Amino acid sequence: AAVTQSPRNKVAVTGEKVTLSCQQTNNHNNMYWYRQDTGHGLRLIHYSYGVGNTEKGDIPDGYEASRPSHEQFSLILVSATPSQSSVYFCASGVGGTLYFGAGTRLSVL
């Protein structure tokens, strides 16, 4: 395909440490992590400009990220809260073009 998120669905428990993993095959420098919620739209949590780099989006709090390699970008909830129940989307991009994954439904109890 091109962008692969993993797992597609996940339940987890308050205080749990979750890693959503994202993989691209486009050789794109840039990778993004958004959450989708019916109030708001996509809101950007963290992104990354290359291996070793992470920068904060608009709603980075309670999350961290890691770009341990060109192809892989990981979103990490430290101590999960039910308010991080959401669908999470990963994207690679270049220039004005953004390639999204299929999403990751996460429920936190």
């Binding site: 290359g50 291996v51 070793g52 920068e55 961290e64």
Partner: protein, 227 residues
Amino acid sequence: AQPDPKLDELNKVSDYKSNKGTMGNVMNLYMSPPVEGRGVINSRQFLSHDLIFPIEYKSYNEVKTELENTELANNYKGKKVDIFGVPYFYTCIIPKSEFGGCCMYGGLTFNSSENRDKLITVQVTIDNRQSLGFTITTNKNMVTIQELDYKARHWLTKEKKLYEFDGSAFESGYIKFTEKNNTSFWFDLFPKKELVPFVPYKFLNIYGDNKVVDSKSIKMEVFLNTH
């Protein structure tokens, strides 16, 4: 000559945070392992003040190391050398033999015997109380400052939260190096507030002089200030 800094001369963790920066970018440089290589020789150059080396570091098969000037490069060009240094990848520029890749600054010494580990002690001062010390070890008689700064920053990062994902245990501070002849110099431990996104090459370029010191005599001091 370079005078010890005043409190208001140091970059502030809270400024980096409030200009939206991610301290973890700096954390990775010092948690992550160094590029190392014993008795290697450069295969090619890109510009004439760098040297490209074959190396194994995670998935990368070569490293461009940058020097402050051409003459520095020529000093190591084609000779048998040891490398020790801090790689970056974002903003790294390294064209193929025939773009992105692995880059660093300086880090070079001549490969000799040298052999026994030497221990160096690092005195840490926090909010003006000298309350801690820890040793680093290198087995090079002549050692680049980079190797020492890295190992010292590594320790403090693992053990004292010098750099965390989203901040630090501290607000500001610096690492001071004093040579046997009493000349000395320092490095602000934290990024410039404007340095967002974090551009690694503007933080690592202090290692570009490839400064080299005597491990037997070097004095190492770190000064930190909490909020």
